[PDB]
């Protein structure tokens, strides 16, 4: 069976091509830069009101409103500056494990093991939040969802596929296939033409939104990938996984360039994010704390004061002003 | 110091908080259950007798108490991600059929499943209930052969009661961490129509325990 021979030959050839590109590791080149010192961030606003553990949260473009989803069957929109509630949307099911906030602030999204993506309208003339469209094209639990614009959305599911939806007609436009296991991570690029995703098969793949094909494939880890985020420049992205290591990849090189880990951490990684400048990499671990890594020298610059339980999601405002972390305490905390 | 609209926004937030509190109090009395098992095991016969996309959910009430029970059969991937979302369940129901041992081992698979369920990382403090079905047929067909086909060192006489106690201790002995969790057992058949009472006793026990642990500071 020469087909398997061709496959393994191409695998070996890709390895040979990749090993030729490297000439000096990023550690050597960047060793001459001054260290970032110590970065201590103090909790300064605690958002209270959930009754069960929080699964996911997301910011908005205005960097003042956020949306939180909880097991209690509620999707609350907060006002970070004044710790007030603007809406409290009741959900059909209590197994929500994802949420999103449209860039224009007109819609929000919710998903879970109900296998249905619900989009809500916030500026209706009726005066109350009402469901606009419900999408039931998937065959498994939805892990993540992100808005490209008010009429488009990309969702990843456990059926090893990610699909792009035209909200108006409710039909799938393009479908993405190639993953071997459940998909759990997804992040859009600053230029929306591209996006990445993560799976439990220990590989993260790069997609093209409209061409319907994969551009590059990365393996990196040896366990499940649970988080993914784009480096602000749009030419790199970090990944988190169960083996307690974060890894940064470069698109134009199709090769790994840095790994973050220390001998005293063994638990998994739930979320990963960058600062606006891209010099910091905040990762939320399972052991009720989050660490901040100097993204250029791999050193550990500080530790956010821990929650009382696991941190399920972590995000940074578009202006880099604050970092919000959700946990299973039923609380959110803003850091700066 | 606040403006005119800020006060109205604060009032709206307070109203939302009041509604959330009321709904949470309403939802603190709807006990959640989770159904497991290697197969159907005739677990739907309770709902049929009582005649009251995503996953299946059933609702019924009994004695001023609301019951919602879920089914794990809707899983589409490995249970690692499917099971953690049910950490808030009060009790977990597990079913075993007593007439499914000599079918043309399965008992070892059931034992491993029970060990993984009751000793699961996420089910830290969830009481487990055991329902053994098809007792009327099990009593007669034991005469052909005991459970020796899969387990060694069978002890006791041929009386069905002692054998039933042996299997009951066989599943119960998997609770190496009984230091934190309780277990209840009860036999059943397709025509007894009395499971709801045992489920009521179990949920009452779990509710009392949770109230003592959470509010009473015991």
């Amino acid at each position: 069976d020469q087909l398997r021979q061709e496959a393994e030959q191409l695998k070996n050839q890709i390895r040979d091509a990749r090993k030729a590109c490297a000439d000096a590791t990023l550690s050597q080149i960047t060793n001459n830069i001054d260290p970032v010192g110590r970065i201590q961030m103090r909790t300064r606003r605690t958002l209270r009101g959930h009754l069960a553990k929080i699964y996911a949260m997301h910011w908005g473009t205005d960097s003042r409103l956020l949306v939180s989803a909880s097991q209690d069957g509620k999707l609350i929109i907060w006002d970070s500056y004044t710790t007030n509630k603007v809406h409290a949307i009741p959900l059909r099911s209590s197994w929500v494990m994802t949420c999103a906030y449209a860039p224009s602030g007109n819609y929000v999204a919710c998903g879970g093991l109900d296998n249905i993506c619900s989009i809500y309208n916030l500026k209706t003339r009726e005066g109350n939040v009402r469901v606009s469209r419900e999408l039931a094209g998937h065959t498994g639990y939805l892990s993540c969802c992100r808005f490209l614009d008010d009429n488009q959305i990309v969702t990843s599911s456990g059926d090893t596929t990610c699909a792009l939806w035209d909200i108006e007609t409710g039909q799938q436009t393009t479908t993405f296939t190639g993953h071997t296991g459940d998909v759990m991570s997804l992040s859009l690029a600053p230029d929306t033409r591209l996006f990445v995703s993560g799976a439990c098969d220990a590989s993260a793949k790069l997609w093209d939104v409209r061409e319907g094909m994969c551009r590059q494939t990365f393996t990196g880890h040896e366990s499940d990938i649970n988080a993914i985020c784009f480096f602000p420049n749009g030419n790199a992205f970090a990944t988190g996984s169960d083996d307690a290591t974060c890894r940064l990849f470069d698109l134009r090189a199709d090769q790994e360039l840095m790994t973050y880990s220390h001998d005293n951490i063994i638990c998994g990684i739930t979320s990963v994010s960058f600062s606006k400048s891209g010099r910091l990499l905040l990762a939320g671990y399972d052991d009720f704390n989050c660490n901040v890594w100097d993204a250029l020298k791999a050193d550990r610059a500080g530790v956010l004061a821990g929650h009382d339980n696991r941190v399920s999601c972590l995000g940074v405002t578009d202006d880099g002003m604050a970092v919000a972390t959700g946990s299973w305490d039923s609380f959110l905390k803003i850091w700066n | 110091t606040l403006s005119a609209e800020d006060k109205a926004a604060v009032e709206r937030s307070k109203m939302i908080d009041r509604n959330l509190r009321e709904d949470g109090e309403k939802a603190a009395r709807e006990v959640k259950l989770l159904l497991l098992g290697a197969g159907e095991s005739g677990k739907s016969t309770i709902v049929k007798q009582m005649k009251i996309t995503g996953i299946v959910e059933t609702h019924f009430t009994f004695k001023d108490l609301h019951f919602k029970m879920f089914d794990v059969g809707g899983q589409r991937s490995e249970r690692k991600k499917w099971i953690h979302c049910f950490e808030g369940v009060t009790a977990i129901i597990f079913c075993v059929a007593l007439s499914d041992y000599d079918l043309v081992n399965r008992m070892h698979e059931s034992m491993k499943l029970f060990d993984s369920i009751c000793n699961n990382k996420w089910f830290t403090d969830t009481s487990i209930i055991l329902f053994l079905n098809k007792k009327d047929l099990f009593e007669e067909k034991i005469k052909k052969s005991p459970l020796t086909i899969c387990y060694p060192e069978y002890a006791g006489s041929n009386t069905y009661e002692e054998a039933a106690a042996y299997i009951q201790c066989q599943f119960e002995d998997l609770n190496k961490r009984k230091d934190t969790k309780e277990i209840y057992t009860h036999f059943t058949c397709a025509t007894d129509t009395k499971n709801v009472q045992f489920v009521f006793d179990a949920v009452t026990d779990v509710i009392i325990k949770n109230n003592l642990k959470d509010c009473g500071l015991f």
């Epitope: 003042r64 006002d79 004044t82 007030n84 603007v86 009726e126 | 110091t1």
Partner: single-chain antibody, 233 residues
């Protein structure tokens, strides 16, 4: 569609009592706090009373307190204004306005058809001069509104509003907080100004938007309205 009708007008002898109600439909009534507004036969508008969601806060005008009372019945979606010991000057047409307050909202977004009531017979002051402004279709014009006390609150918002009352119609919202176009308003209009001087510019006039333009302040109760300026064709 969204409708909001009211009834209870007629002829009332001086010193008597009368009752009028505001029936609302097509929107969540309980989530909106609603106002009452009055208009003299020829003069401008004035603010009467306010009731919030949950009826936890109520306000009145300094010329209304002790006479009127405001209550709401959420289950059947009907407001009420019971007036006692009426006066000759109390004659006016009463509108039934609605407003909701949350970050990014549009208070005073709908006005009722209105009812007519006839009698047998310190605080911010808004100045709006040039009561008459001639204009022709296709020409660009502007109107200036002024406030005695600065409306630039410490939180970065200037609480100013603009309204337009076409002949034989209820007022409609044009600009809220001095820089935001209300839903459904043409992009022709615009608003800008400092903390004490304000202006509204119409880029290109049309015969469909002729009327009286008012400016209202929402920094601290009671609310105040300008004298209104007419545009004549």
């Amino acid at each position: 569609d969204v409708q909001l009708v009211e009834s209870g007008g007629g002829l009332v002898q001086p010193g008597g009592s009368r009752k009028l109600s505001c029936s609302a439909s097509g929107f969540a009534f309980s989530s909106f706090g609603m106002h009452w507004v009055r208009q003299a036969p020829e003069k401008g508008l004035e603010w009467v009373a306010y009731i919030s969601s949950g009826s936890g806060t109520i306000y009145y005008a300094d010329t209304v307190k002790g006479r009127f009372t405001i209550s709401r019945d959420d289950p059947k979606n009907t407001l009420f204004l019971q007036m006692t010991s009426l006066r000759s000057e109390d004659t006016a047409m009463y509108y039934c306005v609605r407003s909701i307050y949350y970050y990014g909202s549009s208070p005073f977004d709908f006005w009722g058809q209105g009812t007519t009531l006839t009698v047998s017979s310190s605080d911010i002051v808004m100045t709006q001069a040039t009561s008459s402004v001639p204009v022709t279709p296709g020409e660009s014009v502007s109107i200036s509104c002024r406030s005695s006390k600065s409306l630039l609150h410490s939180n970065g918002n200037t609480y100013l509003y603009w309204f337009l009352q076409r002949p034989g119609q209820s007022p409609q919202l044009l600009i809220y907080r001095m820089s935001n176009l209300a839903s459904g308003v043409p992009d022709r209009f615009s608003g800008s100004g400092s903390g004490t001087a304000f202006t509204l510019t119409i880029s290109r006039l049309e015969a469909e938007d002729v009327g009286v333009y008012y400016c209202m302040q929402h920094l601290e109760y009671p609310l105040t309205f300008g004298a209104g300026t007419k545009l004549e064709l």
